[PDB]
Amino acid sequence: TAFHRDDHETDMELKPANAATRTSRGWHTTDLKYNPSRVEAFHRYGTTV
Amino acid sequence: TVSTFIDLNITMLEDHEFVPLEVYTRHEIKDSGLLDYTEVQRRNQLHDLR
Ligand SMILES: *[C@@H]1O[C@H](CO)[C@@H](O[C@@H]2O[C@H](CO)[C@@H](O)[C@H](O)[C@H]2NC(C)=O)[C@H](O)[C@H]1NC(C)=O
């Protein structure tokens, strides 16, 4: 089981995929990846869905 | 009138045109493969920009 940005569960708006040539339609919800904020000399895990 | 001649009937062989004919075109042959590798690649390399 996995969460987005290690955050609570949320229903998100399905956004049309950005334009491309010779491709069928698509839809996503998140445009960017999540990476943890910085604390020095540590391992930190960041989840995107 | 009676005739001393002997008949002979010659008609020229008529013209005939040959139209181009193909059982399978090369596009059907390219489509024969269940997976055209190139098209799969082009589709799958658009995921980040899409
Ligand atoms: C000389 O040429 C042909 C025979 O080789 C005959 O011409 C055809 O005759 C048929 C009937 O047998 C007709 O339906 C056609 O209209 C005729 N023309 C063609 C181009 O086929 C012709 O009759 C022969 N001459 C004589 C006196 O019989």
PDB file of C-alpha atoms and ligand atoms in Angstrom:
ATOM      1  CA  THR A   1       0.000   0.000   0.000  1.00  0.00           C
ATOM      2  CA  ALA A   2       1.408   3.369  -1.065  1.00  0.00           C
ATOM      3  CA  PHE A   3       0.541   7.047  -0.544  1.00  0.00           C
ATOM      4  CA  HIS A   4       1.201  10.127  -2.681  1.00  0.00           C
ATOM      5  CA  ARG A   5       3.874  12.441  -1.213  1.00  0.00           C
ATOM      6  CA  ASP A   6       3.511  10.379   1.991  1.00  0.00           C
ATOM      7  CA  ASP A   7       0.253  12.249   2.592  1.00  0.00           C
ATOM      8  CA  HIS A   8      -3.357  11.396   3.391  1.00  0.00           C
ATOM      9  CA  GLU A   9      -5.734   9.844   0.875  1.00  0.00           C
ATOM     10  CA  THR A  10      -7.309  12.286  -1.581  1.00  0.00           C
ATOM     11  CA  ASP A  11      -9.444  12.034  -4.712  1.00  0.00           C
ATOM     12  CA  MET A  12      -7.668  14.058  -7.399  1.00  0.00           C
ATOM     13  CA  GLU A  13      -8.815  15.733 -10.604  1.00  0.00           C
ATOM     14  CA  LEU A  14      -8.025  13.724 -13.742  1.00  0.00           C
ATOM     15  CA  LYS A  15      -6.189  16.118 -16.067  1.00  0.00           C
ATOM     16  CA  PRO A  16      -5.785  15.555 -19.816  1.00  0.00           C
ATOM     17  CA  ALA A  17      -2.275  14.521 -20.796  1.00  0.00           C
ATOM     18  CA  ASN A  18      -0.229  17.271 -22.416  1.00  0.00           C
ATOM     19  CA  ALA A  19      -0.143  17.362 -26.193  1.00  0.00           C
ATOM     20  CA  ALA A  20       1.866  14.972 -28.360  1.00  0.00           C
ATOM     21  CA  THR A  21       1.900  13.939 -32.010  1.00  0.00           C
ATOM     22  CA  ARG A  22       0.646  10.565 -33.293  1.00  0.00           C
ATOM     23  CA  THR A  23      -0.574   9.428 -29.874  1.00  0.00           C
ATOM     24  CA  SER A  24      -3.922   8.439 -28.412  1.00  0.00           C
ATOM     25  CA  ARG A  25      -5.482  10.318 -25.516  1.00  0.00           C
ATOM     26  CA  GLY A  26      -4.374  10.032 -21.907  1.00  0.00           C
ATOM     27  CA  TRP A  27      -5.150  11.523 -18.514  1.00  0.00           C
ATOM     28  CA  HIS A  28      -3.092  11.914 -15.339  1.00  0.00           C
ATOM     29  CA  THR A  29      -3.441  13.617 -11.954  1.00  0.00           C
ATOM     30  CA  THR A  30       0.099  14.493 -10.783  1.00  0.00           C
ATOM     31  CA  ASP A  31       2.547  16.463 -12.922  1.00  0.00           C
ATOM     32  CA  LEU A  32       5.661  16.307 -10.713  1.00  0.00           C
ATOM     33  CA  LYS A  33       7.589  13.839  -8.571  1.00  0.00           C
ATOM     34  CA  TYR A  34       7.908  14.103  -4.795  1.00  0.00           C
ATOM     35  CA  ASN A  35      11.314  14.021  -3.119  1.00  0.00           C
ATOM     36  CA  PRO A  36      11.818  14.519   0.626  1.00  0.00           C
ATOM     37  CA  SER A  37      12.973  17.819   2.042  1.00  0.00           C
ATOM     38  CA  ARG A  38      16.583  18.096   3.146  1.00  0.00           C
ATOM     39  CA  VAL A  39      17.976  17.077   6.513  1.00  0.00           C
ATOM     40  CA  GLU A  40      21.737  16.724   6.504  1.00  0.00           C
ATOM     41  CA  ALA A  41      23.591  13.390   6.341  1.00  0.00           C
ATOM     42  CA  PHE A  42      20.478  11.208   6.295  1.00  0.00           C
ATOM     43  CA  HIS A  43      18.502   8.812   4.117  1.00  0.00           C
ATOM     44  CA  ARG A  44      15.011  10.069   3.275  1.00  0.00           C
ATOM     45  CA  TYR A  45      12.388   8.305   1.147  1.00  0.00           C
ATOM     46  CA  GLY A  46       9.895  10.192  -1.018  1.00  0.00           C
ATOM     47  CA  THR A  47       6.871   8.660  -2.746  1.00  0.00           C
ATOM     48  CA  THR A  48       4.938   9.856  -5.801  1.00  0.00           C
ATOM     49  CA  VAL A  49       1.817   8.162  -7.189  1.00  0.00           C
TER      50      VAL A  49
ATOM     51  CA  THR B   1     -22.767 -14.615-109.895  1.00  0.00           C
ATOM     52  CA  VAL B   2     -20.483 -17.548-109.144  1.00  0.00           C
ATOM     53  CA  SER B   3     -16.946 -17.049-107.871  1.00  0.00           C
ATOM     54  CA  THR B   4     -13.605 -18.720-108.553  1.00  0.00           C
ATOM     55  CA  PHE B   5     -12.120 -17.280-105.340  1.00  0.00           C
ATOM     56  CA  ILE B   6     -11.394 -19.064-102.059  1.00  0.00           C
ATOM     57  CA  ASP B   7     -12.158 -17.046 -98.942  1.00  0.00           C
ATOM     58  CA  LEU B   8      -9.807 -16.426 -96.027  1.00  0.00           C
ATOM     59  CA  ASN B   9     -10.642 -14.340 -92.955  1.00  0.00           C
ATOM     60  CA  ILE B  10      -7.902 -12.707 -90.886  1.00  0.00           C
ATOM     61  CA  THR B  11      -8.705 -10.311 -88.045  1.00  0.00           C
ATOM     62  CA  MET B  12      -5.869  -8.623 -86.175  1.00  0.00           C
ATOM     63  CA  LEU B  13      -5.264  -9.542 -82.543  1.00  0.00           C
ATOM     64  CA  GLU B  14      -6.823  -6.684 -80.586  1.00  0.00           C
ATOM     65  CA  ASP B  15      -4.943  -4.559 -78.077  1.00  0.00           C
ATOM     66  CA  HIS B  16      -4.995  -5.553 -74.414  1.00  0.00           C
ATOM     67  CA  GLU B  17      -3.915  -3.514 -71.394  1.00  0.00           C
ATOM     68  CA  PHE B  18      -2.357  -5.046 -68.271  1.00  0.00           C
ATOM     69  CA  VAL B  19      -3.368  -3.242 -65.071  1.00  0.00           C
ATOM     70  CA  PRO B  20      -1.013  -3.481 -62.063  1.00  0.00           C
ATOM     71  CA  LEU B  21      -1.975  -6.247 -59.651  1.00  0.00           C
ATOM     72  CA  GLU B  22      -0.662  -7.185 -56.197  1.00  0.00           C
ATOM     73  CA  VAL B  23      -1.823 -10.009 -53.940  1.00  0.00           C
ATOM     74  CA  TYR B  24      -0.362  -8.300 -50.855  1.00  0.00           C
ATOM     75  CA  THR B  25       1.093  -4.811 -50.604  1.00  0.00           C
ATOM     76  CA  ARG B  26       4.196  -4.200 -48.508  1.00  0.00           C
ATOM     77  CA  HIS B  27       2.091  -2.193 -46.049  1.00  0.00           C
ATOM     78  CA  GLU B  28       0.000  -5.298 -45.352  1.00  0.00           C
ATOM     79  CA  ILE B  29       3.258  -7.221 -44.921  1.00  0.00           C
ATOM     80  CA  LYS B  30       4.604  -4.645 -42.464  1.00  0.00           C
ATOM     81  CA  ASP B  31       1.257  -4.923 -40.660  1.00  0.00           C
ATOM     82  CA  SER B  32       1.503  -8.735 -40.682  1.00  0.00           C
ATOM     83  CA  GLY B  33       3.792  -8.649 -37.660  1.00  0.00           C
ATOM     84  CA  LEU B  34       1.829  -8.580 -34.430  1.00  0.00           C
ATOM     85  CA  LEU B  35       4.144  -5.892 -32.997  1.00  0.00           C
ATOM     86  CA  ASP B  36       5.911  -3.335 -35.170  1.00  0.00           C
ATOM     87  CA  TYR B  37       8.910  -2.646 -32.939  1.00  0.00           C
ATOM     88  CA  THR B  38       9.410   0.927 -34.179  1.00  0.00           C
ATOM     89  CA  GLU B  39       5.862   2.111 -33.449  1.00  0.00           C
ATOM     90  CA  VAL B  40       5.942   0.521 -29.984  1.00  0.00           C
ATOM     91  CA  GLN B  41       9.196   2.366 -29.284  1.00  0.00           C
ATOM     92  CA  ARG B  42       7.873   5.723 -30.505  1.00  0.00           C
ATOM     93  CA  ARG B  43       4.720   5.395 -28.406  1.00  0.00           C
ATOM     94  CA  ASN B  44       6.519   4.269 -25.248  1.00  0.00           C
ATOM     95  CA  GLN B  45       9.223   6.968 -25.399  1.00  0.00           C
ATOM     96  CA  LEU B  46       6.605   9.744 -25.026  1.00  0.00           C
ATOM     97  CA  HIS B  47       5.611   8.948 -21.438  1.00  0.00           C
ATOM     98  CA  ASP B  48       7.522  11.736 -19.674  1.00  0.00           C
ATOM     99  CA  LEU B  49       6.511  14.413 -22.181  1.00  0.00           C
ATOM    100  CA  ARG B  50       2.941  13.032 -21.972  1.00  0.00           C
TER     101      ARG B  50
HETATM  102  C1  LIG C   1     -14.448 -12.811 -90.249  1.00  0.00           C
HETATM  103  O1  LIG C   1     -14.024 -12.570 -88.856  1.00  0.00           O
HETATM  104  C2  LIG C   1     -14.761 -13.135 -87.755  1.00  0.00           C
HETATM  105  C3  LIG C   1     -14.411 -14.604 -87.665  1.00  0.00           C
HETATM  106  O2  LIG C   1     -13.044 -14.792 -87.326  1.00  0.00           O
HETATM  107  C4  LIG C   1     -16.261 -12.854 -87.843  1.00  0.00           C
HETATM  108  O3  LIG C   1     -16.490 -11.676 -87.086  1.00  0.00           O
HETATM  109  C5  LIG C   1     -17.260 -11.916 -85.905  1.00  0.00           C
HETATM  110  O4  LIG C   1     -18.351 -12.791 -86.097  1.00  0.00           O
HETATM  111  C6  LIG C   1     -19.103 -12.953 -84.891  1.00  0.00           C
HETATM  112  C7  LIG C   1     -20.032 -14.124 -85.106  1.00  0.00           C
HETATM  113  O5  LIG C   1     -19.298 -15.282 -85.485  1.00  0.00           O
HETATM  114  C8  LIG C   1     -19.813 -11.641 -84.592  1.00  0.00           C
HETATM  115  O6  LIG C   1     -20.572 -11.774 -83.395  1.00  0.00           O
HETATM  116  C9  LIG C   1     -18.785 -10.526 -84.434  1.00  0.00           C
HETATM  117  O7  LIG C   1     -19.451  -9.268 -84.414  1.00  0.00           O
HETATM  118  C10 LIG C   1     -17.783 -10.508 -85.593  1.00  0.00           C
HETATM  119  N1  LIG C   1     -16.676  -9.605 -85.303  1.00  0.00           N
HETATM  120  C11 LIG C   1     -15.780  -9.784 -84.319  1.00  0.00           C
HETATM  121  C12 LIG C   1     -14.727  -8.725 -84.196  1.00  0.00           C
HETATM  122  O8  LIG C   1     -15.819 -10.751 -83.557  1.00  0.00           O
HETATM  123  C13 LIG C   1     -16.728 -12.564 -89.264  1.00  0.00           C
HETATM  124  O9  LIG C   1     -18.095 -12.937 -89.402  1.00  0.00           O
HETATM  125  C14 LIG C   1     -15.887 -13.312 -90.283  1.00  0.00           C
HETATM  126  N2  LIG C   1     -16.439 -13.154 -91.621  1.00  0.00           N
HETATM  127  C15 LIG C   1     -17.471 -13.861 -92.092  1.00  0.00           C
HETATM  128  C16 LIG C   1     -17.893 -13.550 -93.497  1.00  0.00           C
HETATM  129  O10 LIG C   1     -18.061 -14.690 -91.406  1.00  0.00           O
END
